[PDB]
Structure 1
Amino acid sequence: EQIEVDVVAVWKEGYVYENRGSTSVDQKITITKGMKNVNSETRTVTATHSIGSTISTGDAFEIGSVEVSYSHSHEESQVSMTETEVYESKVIEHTITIPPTSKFTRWQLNADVGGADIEYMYLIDEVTPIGGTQSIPQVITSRAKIIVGRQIILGKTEIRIKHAERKEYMTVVSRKSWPAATLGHSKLFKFVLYEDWGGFRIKTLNTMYSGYEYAYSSDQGGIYFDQGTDNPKQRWAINKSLPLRHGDVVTFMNKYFTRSGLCYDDGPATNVYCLDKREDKWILEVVG
C-alpha cells in the first residue's frame, strides 16, 4: 500500500575540488557521524569513626596552660560506580579517481520526505571538465513513492504504544486505587485512539478497574485513566497529521496542559508523566 510524495532536499555541506594538473588524483572522503551515550550511576557509602581526646590544664596549673589535643579517625568508604556506554558510528568513505582538468563536486543535501516525516542524507558527487557553469543545488525536490505500513483507523484498531528511546511499551498498573500508565516490557497492553472534536483520546482495553478507560493528566502530572467525559484533560494532541500509520513516531501533547506532553520520568510509583517541556517520542504499532 504505497503512496506518492514530494521529497525536498535542502543543502547542508558542499565541497569542490578542481584538479588542473596533467596527472590524475585519487581522492578519499570519509564522512563519520558518531553518537556515544554513557549512563553512570555511582553509589558511595562513607563511614567515619573519630575519637578525639583533649587534656587541658589552665586554671590549677596557673601560669599559662598546656592543652594536648589527641585525635583519631578511621574512615571506611565504599564506592561503586556503574557506567553503561552505548556508542553508534556511521563512517562513509568514497574513493574516486578524479581525471586531469576535471573538477569533482560533492553536494551533501539533507532530504526531508514530506508527510511521513522521514529524512535521509542525500549526497551528490559530480565529476565534470573545466571551466564550466557551476550548478549548486540549494534545494532539490524529488517525487518519491513511500511504501507505507497499515493505516490506523481511529476507533476499531488495537495499537500498542512504545517509547522510542527506551524501547519499552506503555502498560497499565494500579497507582493508588486508580489505573495509571507506566512503561513496561509487556506487549499484552493495547490501546485504541479515538478522535472527537476536542482532540485525541487514548483509551485502554486492558484495565484493572472497570469503566476507568480513557487516559488523562492529573494536577500533579502523572497519567491515570478515567471514564469518557467532555473533559479537555483526557484529550491529547498528536504531532503528525492524519491518518496515523504503522511505526509512526508521535508526541502526545495534553489539550488542557498545553505545555506538557506524555513522557518518561523517574517518579515515585509511576514513570509515565505529563511534565512541562517534555515531548517524548512514542512509536505506536498495530497488533496482528
Structure 2
Amino acid sequence: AAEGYEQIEVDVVAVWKEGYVYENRGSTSVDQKITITKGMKNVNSETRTVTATHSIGSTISTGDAFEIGSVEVSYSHSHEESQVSMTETEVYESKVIEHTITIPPTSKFTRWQLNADVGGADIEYMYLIDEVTPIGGTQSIPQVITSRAKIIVGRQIILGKTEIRIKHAERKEYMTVVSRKSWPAATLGHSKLFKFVLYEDWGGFRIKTLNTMYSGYEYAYSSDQGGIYFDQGTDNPKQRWAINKSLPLRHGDVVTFMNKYFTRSGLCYDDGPATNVYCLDKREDKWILEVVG
C-alpha cells in the first residue's frame, strides 16, 4: 500500500456460526436482549501490524508481520449467491451493536454469525443475516463459497542482492561500521549511509557491510572477547548468524541475530569502551530490517 510495501491477496479460513437463535413456541411476541461486538479480538490499537499465529498458504509463515487491507467472503443463502467485503478500518475497530427483538408467533428467529481466521487474527461478527422461519419449516444454511483477504507485508529482501539498513529497535539507531583496533567494527549511530546485504548458506546467515574502511574485511562476526568486527568471507561459524523469523525476510521485519558458534550469545547493544554493538551471552536484542528506496 505505502512506499516499500506490497499488497497480496490470499485465501483465508471463514466460517458461519449460529450466533443467536430464539424459538418462540408460544403465541404473541416475547422480548429478549442481545448485544454483539463486530471486530478483531485483542486489537493492539497502537499498531495495525499483526504477527502470525498460524500460516496463510505459502505467503505467510508463522511469526510474520502483516496488515489486513480487507477481508472478502462469498456466501450462498436461500439459493442466492452474494458477497461482503470488510475494509481495513472495519477489521481493526471494535463496533458494539445492541438491540431487543420481537419474534413472530410460532416462529424461530436465527442470526447467523460469520467469522474469519486471517493468519491467527480472529475477526468476529464480520457479517450476519437475520433469517426468520416458522417452527418446523427447514431454514436455509448459509455456506461459504470463497473466503479471501488482502494483506500488506513489506517488500521481499532478496538474499545476496537487496541493500538494507539494520536499525536497533529500542534505541532507534542504525548499525554503522567504524574503526576499532585497526579493524572494521560495528557500532550504533544515526547515519543512514551504512547499508548491508544479507546472505544465507549451509552455515546460516551472514551480514555483509558495504561501508568497510578496510576493503575485503566485510562480514560481521563475534570475537572471543564478545565484540563485533567484520572479516573476509570464510566458512567460520563465528561470522554466521541465526534469525528467529522464517524466510523470506521482508521490509520492516523485527529480528534477533544469534551467533552460530556462540549458540547462546546474540547481537546486542552494550555501552563498551570504543564501540557499543556486541554479541553477548544470554542476550537477544531486536533489530529492524528496512530496504533503501
TM-score class normalised by the smaller sequence: 0.5 to 0.7
- The CA deviation at 1:109 is 15
d(CA) in 1 for partners of 2:228, 2:143: 45
Q: Following the alignment from structure 2 to structure 1, what is the Cα–Cα distance between the partners of residues 160 and 275?
A: 27
Deviation readout 1:154-200 (Å, 9 max, x if unpaired): 01111111011111000001111111100100010110001111110
TM-score normalized with structure 1 length? 0.55
Does the Cα contact within 8 Å between 2:73 and 2:83 map onto a contact in 1?
A: no
What is the SS of the residue equivalent to 2:90? Answer: strand
Could you give the per-residue CA deviations for residues 107-153 of structure 1, whole angstroms, max 9, x where no partner exists?
Answer: 99999974999999999999999999999999999964322221111
User: In the alignment, does 2:198 pair up with 1:198?
Assistant: no
Q: 2-side partners of 1:59 and 1:197: how far apart?
A: 23
SS at 1:55 equivalent: coil
Matched, 1:162 2:167: yes
The gaps in structure 1 that reach 5 residues or longer are none
Match of residue 245 from structure 1: 250
Equivalent residues of 1:46, 1:78 under 8 A apart: no
What displacement does 1:241 show? 1.1
Counterparts of 2:67 and 2:249 in 1: how far apart (Å)? 93
CA contact 1:6–1:114 (8 Å) conserved in 2: no
Q: Could you give the per-residue CA deviations for residues 58-90 of structure 1, whole angstroms, max 9, x where no partner exists?
A: 999999999999999999999999999999999
Query: Greater Rg, structure 1 or structure 2?
Result: 1
Report how far residue 38 of structure 1 moved: 26
The offset of 1:2, in angstroms, is 2.5
Once residues 230 and 32 of structure 1 are traced to their aligned partners in structure 2, the CA distance between those partners, rounded to angstroms, is 56
Q: How many residues align?
A: 288
Q: Which moved more, 1:144-153 or 1:173-182?
A: 144-153
| Between 58-67 and 125-134, the greater mean CA deviation after superposition | 58-67
Change in CA separation of 1:112 and 1:22 when aligned onto 2, cut-off 3 Å: same
**Normalized against structure 2, the TM-score is what?**
0.54
The answer to whether the 8 A contact 1:172-1:180 is kept is yes
Equivalent pair of 2:60/2:119 in contact (CA under 8 Å): no
Give RMSD over aligned pairs: 26.4
Structure 2 stretches of 5 or more lacking a match? Answer: 1-5
Preserved CA contact (<8 Å) 1:162 1:283: yes
- Whole-angstrom CA distance in 2 between matches of 1:111 and 1:65: 11
What is the CA-CA distance between 1:204 and the residue it aligns to? 0.6
- Superposed structure 1 runs of 4+ greater than 2 Å apart: 1-145
Kindly tell me: are residues 202 and 61 of structure 1, through their superposed partners in 2, closer, same or farther at Cα, counting changes over 3 Å?
A: closer
Question: Structure 2: how far apart are the matches of 1:266 and 1:233?
Answer: 22
Distance verdict in 2 for CA 1:225–1:143, change over 3 Å: same
CA contact (8 A) 2:50 2:67 kept: no
Following the alignment from structure 2 to structure 1, what is the Cα–Cα distance between the partners of residues 151 and 64? 96
Structure 2 Cα separation of the partners of residues 173 and 271 of structure 1: 11
Q: Is the 8 A contact 1:263 1:279 kept in 2?
A: yes
**% identical aligned pairs:** 100
Tell me the SS of whatever aligns to 1:21. Answer: coil
Describe the SS at the equivalent of 1:85: helix
Deviations 1:173-232 (A, max 9, x none): 111111110010001011000111111010011101111100100111110101100100
